[PDB]
Amino acid sequence: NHNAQALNTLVKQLSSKFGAISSVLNDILSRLDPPEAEVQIDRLITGRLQSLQTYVTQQLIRAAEIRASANLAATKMSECVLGQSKRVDFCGKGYH
Amino acid sequence: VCGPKKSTNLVKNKCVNFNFNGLTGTGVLTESNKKFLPFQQFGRDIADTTDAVRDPQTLEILDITPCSFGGVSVITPGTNTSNQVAVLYQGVNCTEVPSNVFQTRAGCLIGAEYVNNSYECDIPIGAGICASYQTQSQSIIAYTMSLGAENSVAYSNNSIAIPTNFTISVTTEILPVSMTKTSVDCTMYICGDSTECSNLLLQYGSF
Amino acid sequence: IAIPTNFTISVTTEILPVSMTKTSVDCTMYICGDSTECSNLLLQYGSFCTQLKRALTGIAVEQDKNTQEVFAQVKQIYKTPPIKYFGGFNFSQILPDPSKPSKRSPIEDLLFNKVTLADAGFIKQYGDCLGDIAARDLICAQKFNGLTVLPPLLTDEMIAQYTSALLAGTITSGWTFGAGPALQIPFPMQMAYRFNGIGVTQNVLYENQKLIANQFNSAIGKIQDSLSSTPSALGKLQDVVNHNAQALNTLVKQLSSKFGAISSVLNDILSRLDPPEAEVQIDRLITGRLQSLQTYVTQQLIRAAEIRASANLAATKMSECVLGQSKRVDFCGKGYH
Amino acid sequence: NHNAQALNTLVKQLSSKFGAISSVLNDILSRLDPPEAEVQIDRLITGR
Amino acid sequence: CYGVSPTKLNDLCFTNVYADSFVIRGNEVSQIAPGQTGNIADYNYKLP
Numbered sequence: 001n002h003n004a005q006a007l008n009t010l011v012k013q014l015s016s017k018f019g020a021i022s023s024v025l026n027d028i029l030s031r032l033d034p035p036e037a038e039v040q041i042d043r044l045i046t047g048r049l050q051s052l053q054t055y056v057t058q059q060l061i062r063a064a065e066i067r068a069s070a071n072l073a074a075t076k077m078s079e080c081v082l083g084q085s086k087r088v089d090f091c092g093k094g095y096h
Numbered sequence: 097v098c099g100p101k102k103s104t105n106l107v108k109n110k111c112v113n114f115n116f117n118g119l120t121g122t123g124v125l126t127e128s129n130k131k132f133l134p135f136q137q138f139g140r141d142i143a144d145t146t147d148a149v150r151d152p153q154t155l156e157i158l159d160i161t162p163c164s165f166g167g168v169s170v171i172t173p174g175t176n177t178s179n180q181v182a183v184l185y186q187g188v189n190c191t192e193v194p195s196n197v198f199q200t201r202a203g204c205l206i207g208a209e210y211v212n213n214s215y216e217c218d219i220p221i222g223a224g225i226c227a228s229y230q231t232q233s234q235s236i237i238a239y240t241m242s243l244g245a246e247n248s249v250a251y252s253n254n255s256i257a258i259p260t261n262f263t264i265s266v267t268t269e270i271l272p273v274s275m276t277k278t279s280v281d282c283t284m285y286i287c288g289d290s291t292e293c294s295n296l297l298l299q300y301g302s303f
Numbered sequence: 304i305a306i307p308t309n310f311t312i313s314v315t316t317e318i319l320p321v322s323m324t325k326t327s328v329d330c331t332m333y334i335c336g337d338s339t340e341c342s343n344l345l346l347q348y349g350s351f352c353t354q355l356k357r358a359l360t361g362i363a364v365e366q367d368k369n370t371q372e373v374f375a376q377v378k379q380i381y382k383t384p385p386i387k388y389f390g391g392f393n394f395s396q397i398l399p400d401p402s403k404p405s406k407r408s409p410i411e412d413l414l415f416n417k418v419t420l421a422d423a424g425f426i427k428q429y430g431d432c433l434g435d436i437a438a439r440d441l442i443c444a445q446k447f448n449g450l451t452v453l454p455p456l457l458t459d460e461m462i463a464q465y466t467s468a469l470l471a472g473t474i475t476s477g478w479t480f481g482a483g484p485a486l487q488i489p490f491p492m493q494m495a496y497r498f499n500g501i502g503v504t505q506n507v508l509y510e511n512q513k514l515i516a517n518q519f520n521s522a523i524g525k526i527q528d529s530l531s532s533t534p535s536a537l538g539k540l541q542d543v544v545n546h547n548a549q550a551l552n553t554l555v556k557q558l559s560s561k562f563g564a565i566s567s568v569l570n571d572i573l574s575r576l577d578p579p580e581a582e583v584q585i586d587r588l589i590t591g592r593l594q595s596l597q598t599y600v601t602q603q604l605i606r607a608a609e610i611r612a613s614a615n616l617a618a619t620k621m622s623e624c625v626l627g628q629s630k631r632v633d634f635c636g637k638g639y640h
Numbered sequence: 641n642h643n644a645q646a647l648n649t650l651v652k653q654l655s656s657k658f659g660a661i662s663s664v665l666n667d668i669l670s671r672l673d674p675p676e677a678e679v680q681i682d683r684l685i686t687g688r
Numbered sequence: 689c690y691g692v693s694p695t696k697l698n699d700l701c702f703t704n705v706y707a708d709s710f711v712i713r714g715n716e717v718s719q720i721a722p723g724q725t726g727n728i729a730d731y732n733y734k735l736p
Contacts, residue, residue, distance in 0.1 A: 003276045009350055010280075016349030019586045025288050034723030038296065042659045045297055047348070048286045053303070054354070054597060059278055061604050066275055068612065073271040088627030089376070090619075092267040094482045120570045122337065126433055143444035143552065144559045147437050161433045162447050167327060187451055189428040201425055202454050217456075220367060223425075224458040241456075243464055247379035249475040250487045253390075257479075257486035300687070301656030302649060563682050661691045671700065672693045 002062070010055045018047030106151065111163035116149045123162040132157045164192040166203065171219055171236060173229040182207035182236045184221060198238060200225045208238035217241035312518040314526055315636040318539050319617040321373045322366040323610050324422060324547045325453035326603060327359055333449035333558075334592040336569050340578070344585055351593060358600050362607045367456040369614035374457065374465040376621060381471040381485060389474060389490040391516035396523050399467045407463045413530050415459075417537050421548040424454025441548075445555045452551075473625055481626030500628045501639040546606065554599045562591030658687030690722065708733070 017023045020040040028037050079085035108125040139148025148159050166188035172181040186203030198210045202222025217226035226241040287293035330352035335341035399406040422442045432443040472480035477493040479486040495505035530536050561567045564584040572584045623629035657663045660680040668680045719726040722735045
């Protein structure tokens, strides 16, 4: 659900104007001169790139969490399935 | 020369808007015990924000404190179960909110009846208080979460306990291993297949 | 070959952070000083406010989750018998004292006194925010700008009760309470089991229980002296609290930055410039404040990941050393645990 | 290699204009008046 | 002036400067500029 909601938020951030007159690039390209549309396209690109960088940072944090959880799961496998771990509460409650 | 300023009467201890020689803001005014210097006019704390000001008509000093506020947290069970909800004014006293109003250490809770008994924490409220939705006649009841069942070990100098039987049990442990691979077309996401947009995006480097 | 003819029981302190102070930031009140036009212009930036609120709520929930996973590992709440004799071992310095207002041990009292928390998250009923306290407390100024610190779920009393239950289970049942039901057992027999686990015969303990109890009492006594000798013993928790307070101070100080505008005060720009020429400055102010908020949220997420790793490590240490007898070298302190 | 590539990318990001007339600071400082060069210096500082 | 200051012009260098001279109507002076369109901008003289 976190991945799905992150994708939905990233695809929704395109609806933002970031101070521009409109969020649609085609509208700005249609009813503005290139020298007058550049000042809006720059802000749109800045906002979308900031959204992308925030999404990439969140995905990197989630990937670090997933790497930690996967290392933990591999340790659980190697110590409980492939062997008999003596660590208390590592392979479930009670004598594993 | 700016013409007549037309000051008004001073009002204290109330949530009003204040203006002192151009400095505007919103907050209450209370008699302070500070020792402002004769030439100093504005009072500022460590956080680089105004907390006091000198009145222009009288040299007395008054503290500046914004009106009461706080987060509004709503406690509700599943929608398919009931429609009654509870409101939690965290960080705000109950006397400052304006039948079952209760004051917790985490904030003022309205809409939940406090009980002396304790159960497992269903909905974490804060400061050790948790709320459940129970038929006490269903209502949201507030209570102190119980840490566990009361038990005492019969310790002694020569008493030992040894089990005569055992029960094999299986416990499931869920651990994530991976997630969905995200691939984002940066040029197509930022720019809707436009040429001038792509040329302007190329100016931002290798982001 | 070299074989030791004696031994010295030692106690080594290991401090690991479990959680940190929660943080809830209202973007509308932080970036905008209750202004209507500012709040309307803020809506044009999308759901960054929602993302920040979701991240802060996730951090706040994860702190309580880590606290529960660390301290609430026991099923029942065990208590010590009225007779505090355990074969010569003196646990009065670690057992809770009923004579104190709070049910904490003297060592826990020293730990709580060495750490100076900035904000506890309790109720500030509009009385400690003004007067002479405002000129010395920075927490109120932070709260005035939307930086609201939330109190943890488990209070200090509940953490103390959990610690006392863990201690009682450890001293009255050994490792049996961690696996299944608590089984009473004399403490010298528990020490004999531990010695058999470290590879030492139990007769060595049954012949020198007096010396072992004396060394244990001396070590417990010297622990308090070592903790009170310098505040650097709790340096990890001290640095965590200092980093949280410094991040809050930096976030509340970034409001004074102009970010290229004519002034940092929103009302000054609203009164000195027309709306069409002041919107270009309000946009820069909102962009700078939102960038500051995003940087703060990223730093808080990294610190929360570090705190989660430390809390998982602390829970592993608990389950392996308190609830059991870990054979991992240098895990439960240096030497044979 | 990741450390070296991060350093190279950080030292190469100075080549970007970020919407300015030039990525060189001295060029903007010598080609525009202070009130006209401030709007480009702001963009350069924001990008860097 | 585009990219250069109208005042800070006596302290720079140029490769080759080309002066284009033409007379247009008063209402179409806004048409001689980069990106602008119109009769003169499409059929007479267009700036890149």
